Design a protein around this ligand. Sequence first.
Ligand SMILES: C[S@@+](CC[C@H](N)C(=O)[O-])C[C@H]1O[C@@H](n2cnc3c(N)ncnc32)[C@H](O)[C@@H]1O
Length: 424
Amino acid sequence: QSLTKKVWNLATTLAGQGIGFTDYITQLTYLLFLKMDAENVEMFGEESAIPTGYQWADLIAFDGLDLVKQYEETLKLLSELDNLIGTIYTKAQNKIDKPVYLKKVITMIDEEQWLIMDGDVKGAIYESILEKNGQDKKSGAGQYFTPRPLIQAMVDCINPQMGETVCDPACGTGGFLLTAYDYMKGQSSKEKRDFLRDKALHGVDNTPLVVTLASMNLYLHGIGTDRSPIVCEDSLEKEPSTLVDVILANPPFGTRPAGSVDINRPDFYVETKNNQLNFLQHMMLMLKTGGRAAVVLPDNVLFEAGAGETIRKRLLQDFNLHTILRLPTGIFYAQGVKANVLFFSKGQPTKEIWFYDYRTDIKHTLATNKLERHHLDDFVSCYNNRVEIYDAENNPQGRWRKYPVDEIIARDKTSLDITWIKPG
Ligand SMILES: C[S@@+](CC[C@H](N)C(=O)[O-])C[C@H]1O[C@@H](n2cnc3c(N)ncnc32)[C@H](O)[C@@H]1O
């Protein structure tokens, strides 16, 4: 709030040098955590945990190639540490080679009092910064972000409860985990208030800086003290060591980058190069019996022949794919995206699949008619009240329709890419 504007103007200035928004924001985060540590030494007494010689006061004293060297040394030592600090500084790395322009970020962070602010305030500034980068049409940070309105509706439908484990195995900025924690925190303790605190959440992302942003975000909203729920791993690489109650995820829509290690997963139902089918497999394999998932996936997952069908067959047999939400265009960073939310539990077969079409004749964009949480109110009510809106003769254009599993098994390729609403 005016602090946000100052953060945004330093962003364009570094952009003026060769320094992009995502890089700026990681360096801002590295510096912010360090400053806040120092503040906590005055504001509440105790000894720092940051090594001696590398605290905030040591940093601000240098100016030249010397400033850049001290900063880099500082990031090296912190990355070597454990728990929350080590997570914030995961494979930490300076991207600002220019002393003058680093000193500007340092100087801006130094001049405020971060501990003291309303605490909600730090959260909301950070969420606001993450979003403005995330919906930046030519910055491509949207690959690291999901719109909050949609996360909220998903968490509301899944309805996580105190005592459950929640995992997002492709966590980006940590929005699902942040929202599921807020949802659970306001419910009726104490083995379980402590469970939420220490044991409920887990997030995985393979990209170091994104782990830095996620672990900071969770921390700035009061999630954790000395430990982070976020780990830096490649989810597809390894069979999961622990099964969970709830999965919440928006996995990458893009291909696995070239030169990434080849995966070796005998536990998978089928070998495929489709990155999204593999995330879907990995997540099905991650659930406990009785567990449930809500996951954002592309249309391709619903129609693709070969491996896709094999997996959709497995999904119908051993899981209850009770709900598919068809998402509108114009809500993700890179619009065009044809996406869907699939909700399913593990154990029981699918007998019926309820479709909610929020795509056909729906018009959102990032600049005008923005998606907000109230647009998914009807969906959420349908989710809870399993009474068909569609009727062949009374309401053929109704958004909520139930299909028995036998019609789906009878479709070509076992396709789940079903619509029925005439645009006309
Ligand atoms: C669309 S983002 C998730 C956004 C998140 N829902 C939020 O609140 O910001 C997808 C994430 O998956 C990560 N990712 C890509 N490949 C991965 C992999 N193999 N293992 C774990 N994470 C991966 C990306 O780095 C990216 O942050």
